[PDB]
Design an enzyme around this catalytic site. Sequence first.
Site, PDB file in Angstrom:
ATOM      1  CG  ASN A  15      -1.808   1.192   1.303  1.00  0.00           C
ATOM      2  OD1 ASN A  15      -1.460   2.244   0.617  1.00  0.00           O
ATOM      3  ND2 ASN A  15      -2.964   1.082   2.129  1.00  0.00           N
TER       4      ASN A  15
ATOM      5  CG  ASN B 112      -7.348   7.941  11.811  1.00  0.00           C
ATOM      6  OD1 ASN B 112      -7.650   8.386  12.927  1.00  0.00           O
ATOM      7  ND2 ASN B 112      -6.014   7.440  11.644  1.00  0.00           N
TER       8      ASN B 112
ATOM      9  NE  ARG C 170      -4.284   2.568  -0.865  1.00  0.00           N
ATOM     10  CZ  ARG C 170      -4.869   3.615  -0.684  1.00  0.00           C
ATOM     11  NH1 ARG C 170      -6.280   3.648  -0.582  1.00  0.00           N
ATOM     12  NH2 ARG C 170      -4.140   4.772  -0.618  1.00  0.00           N
TER      13      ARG C 170
ATOM     14  CG  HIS D 252     -13.193   3.323   3.794  1.00  0.00           C
ATOM     15  ND1 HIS D 252     -13.555   4.533   4.358  1.00  0.00           N
ATOM     16  CD2 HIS D 252     -11.616   3.324   4.143  1.00  0.00           C
ATOM     17  CE1 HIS D 252     -12.801   5.403   4.776  1.00  0.00           C
ATOM     18  NE2 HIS D 252     -11.660   4.711   4.714  1.00  0.00           N
TER      19      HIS D 252
ATOM     20  NE  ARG E  42     -10.027  12.928   4.217  1.00  0.00           N
ATOM     21  CZ  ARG E  42      -9.680  11.631   4.191  1.00  0.00           C
ATOM     22  NH1 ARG E  42     -10.492  10.764   4.654  1.00  0.00           N
ATOM     23  NH2 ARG E  42      -8.523  11.205   3.405  1.00  0.00           N
TER      24      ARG E  42
ATOM     25  CD  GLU F 128      -8.931  -1.600   4.237  1.00  0.00           C
ATOM     26  OE1 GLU F 128      -8.161  -1.201   5.153  1.00  0.00           O
ATOM     27  OE2 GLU F 128      -9.580  -0.594   3.676  1.00  0.00           O
TER      28      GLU F 128
ATOM     29  CB  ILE G 278     -13.524   4.735  15.290  1.00  0.00           C
ATOM     30  CG1 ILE G 278     -12.559   5.710  15.591  1.00  0.00           C
ATOM     31  CG2 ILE G 278     -14.915   4.936  16.139  1.00  0.00           C
ATOM     32  CD1 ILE G 278     -13.040   6.891  14.680  1.00  0.00           C
ATOM     33  N   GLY G 279     -14.833   1.721  15.049  1.00  0.00           N
ATOM     34  CA  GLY G 279     -15.809   0.676  15.145  1.00  0.00           C
ATOM     35  C   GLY G 279     -15.516  -0.524  15.905  1.00  0.00           C
TER      36      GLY G 279
ATOM     37  CG  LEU H 280     -12.884   8.754  18.542  1.00  0.00           C
ATOM     38  CD1 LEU H 280     -13.963   7.699  18.389  1.00  0.00           C
ATOM     39  CD2 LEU H 280     -13.750  10.136  18.988  1.00  0.00           C
TER      40      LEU H 280
END
Lengths: 394, 394
Positions: free
Chosen positions: B8, B203, B83, B172, B233, B378, B324-325, B276
């Site tokens: 990547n 992020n 990617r 994503h 963002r 990923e 985060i999730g 976070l």
Amino acid sequence: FPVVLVINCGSSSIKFSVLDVATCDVLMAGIADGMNTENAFLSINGDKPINLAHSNYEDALKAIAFELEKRDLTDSVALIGHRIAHGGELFTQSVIITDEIIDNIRRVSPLAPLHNYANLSGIDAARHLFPAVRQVAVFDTSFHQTLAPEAYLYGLPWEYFSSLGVRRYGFHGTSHRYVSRRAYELLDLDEKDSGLIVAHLGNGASICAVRNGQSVDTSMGMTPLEGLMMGTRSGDVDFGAMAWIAKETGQTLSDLERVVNKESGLLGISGLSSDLRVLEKAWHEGHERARLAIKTFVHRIARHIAGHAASLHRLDGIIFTGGIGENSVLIRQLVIEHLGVLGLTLDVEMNKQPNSHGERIISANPSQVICAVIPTNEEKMIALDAIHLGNVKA
Amino acid sequence: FPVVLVINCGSSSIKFSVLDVATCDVLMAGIADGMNTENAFLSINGDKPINLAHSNYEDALKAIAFELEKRDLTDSVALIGHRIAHGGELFTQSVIITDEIIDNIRRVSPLAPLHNYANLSGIDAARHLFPAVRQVAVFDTSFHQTLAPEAYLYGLPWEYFSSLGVRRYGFHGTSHRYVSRRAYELLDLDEKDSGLIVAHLGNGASICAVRNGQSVDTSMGMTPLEGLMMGTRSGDVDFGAMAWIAKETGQTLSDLERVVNKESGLLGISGLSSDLRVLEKAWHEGHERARLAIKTFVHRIARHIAGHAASLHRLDGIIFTGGIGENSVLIRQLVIEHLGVLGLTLDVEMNKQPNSHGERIISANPSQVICAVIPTNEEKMIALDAIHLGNVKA
Ligand SMILES: Nc1ccn([C@@H]2O[C@H](COP(=O)(O)OP(=O)(O)OP(=O)(O)O)[C@@H](O)[C@H]2O)c(=O)n1
Ligand SMILES: Nc1ccn([C@@H]2O[C@H](COP(=O)(O)OP(=O)(O)OP(=O)(O)O)[C@@H](O)[C@H]2O)c(=O)n1
């Protein structure tokens, strides 16, 4: 037999209406179109239009004022309502116009320069021509002031909000408010325990979530350019895409402002018209781009309706209103069929009925959420505020 | 015992991973951070970082290539995954890299100039260092290609789409795709009759609606700047507000691009951090702006989740993923509590469990829609594509 005069000084016109206090009915209506241009004319009730070309905001209202005395109702004007485009954070409800209010409207005028200064010119004239008449200011933004910071803040740096006032304001507040109050009677709901979605759909279009009688979310932002795709307005648009276009076509932000505000939306995609009745027939005649414009329009309405539903503890009703929402059998069905995820069953017989049937429920029994059509009446809501405020001692 | 090399090439780094074909496990991982700057270094597995300062994209991959031979696994590299940030309308699935593919990626490169050219530099290097090794391109956009015109068109004039390619692409896609496939097993769902919402939260954050195995809506647009508020963002922002700010501060669209992309979001509102874990503790310590940043973040996630739900015939599951999730007990609960309108009951015991518990359902029985946490992978999805494409005759 007192009457109320409702004035709306837009960007290029002065829309007026005279309403009876007893029944809130329209006794007279008209428009002073072509303001500040060498072709200013005054058309009333759809009859013979007078002129007085290139007349100022004060003289155009003075022209109407003479027509009121000609029809013996100048002595009957008890109250005067003014629609204001932007009320900032300063206005949460309708107020009696005083010197303080004029200062405050002039303070929040930078937030909507084109429209607010026209409103102030409209106030100034009406104060001249009607000195002993109580005058009321009704704000397009005031209803959305019950919004929480989470709902009105942008992702931008904090400085822009605190030091420049950059936040969501939302519009059609008077329509959203009126339709809401009416929806509690039609749906036999308790205002203190209710959750509504109001889709105001016209050339300018916005969604509003009304939880427990209060606005908790609305699709338009600081300007009328955010949210739904509209007649000439694009709606929600990627800012990264706008920056990319600027680098490619050499256009500036001021250039793209006109493109987004006046050349986009239904007009933009179809390349035919902003009018729906035109595009509905165009698609009926096999026009490809008209179908896509309508399907996108429908898609973005369903996305925001369902999005705004998250700001409710419970969803009781979805209410359609505005020129499109009141009259479009197709768009209503397409949007509702696009919201099967919420379990809406549409009664097509009830949805087929024209606007003459007024306030009407258009959803079937097995439907989990009630769908209804309620014709908005912004003039009536302005009058009802003036009548209420006519009892006040100042 | 063959392995797959996953590369990547970001804007400032080269993130790599070596995965075993037998188990799809990570045997080696690292990053070549500080690209094109006089401080380029290569850190592997969190151990001692080598340097080779101000090295080009070709030499930085060549540095890793030497480390692969040092650990006797150069002879075991059967496949190489790349990617790609943007695949335009040209790529709907993962492909074997050929001269044709390189031309096509170079064709859609103007849509994402910063990131795609870095990817092409990464392809170029890997082709040099591994000539007899099959190489695969995996696109961040390809999964969202099943979107209908209504879902991907902007309100802008038609010319911008047809002649310039201005449309929603969404990102994503590899994460959204992977998490989806995994969600069918965990929730015991039939892929051909399913409706999922995937919230990829890091992020960079995006929502995706997956109807019947296909992406039907996604929150990011032409750029990663649309949709949810993120780390740096802003997310969805009124263009009319951006034009107004430009007139007031004298800033240009290029100036505001940096503000929106790098100075906004969680960083913008709180004025503290994009992270976070920092802001969760800051709010715990009574920081006002940190609480508002999180509450706005949560609000805009719930608005888009529910918005994207409209693109489904039925909503079966909501899946959280990303840094985060996967790890935020608070944000998940706040977002779910914000979606009571859909009838989600949260099991807080199950929601309390850390990411070590991997794929896990976090919703109670009375909940109408199943909520679950599925850690995205990923690299694994890129490897699985390469393994599949390793059987192909070219
Ligand atoms: N019988 C009618 C009348 C109106 N319309 C549509 O409704 C839109 C105009 O709505 P309207 O509320 O009258 O717009 P405005 O008067 O400008 O007010 P606003 O835009 O704020 O809603 C037009 O696209 C028109 O095609 C319709 O579908 N059928
Ligand atoms: N145990 C952890 C680890 C991560 N995070 C949060 O997750 C975010 C980073 O997510 P991540 O997916 O790792 O971001 P990236 O690696 O940059 O990938 P992307 O942004 O595309 O999601 C940070 O805000 C961090 O606070 C968290 O809440 N708790």
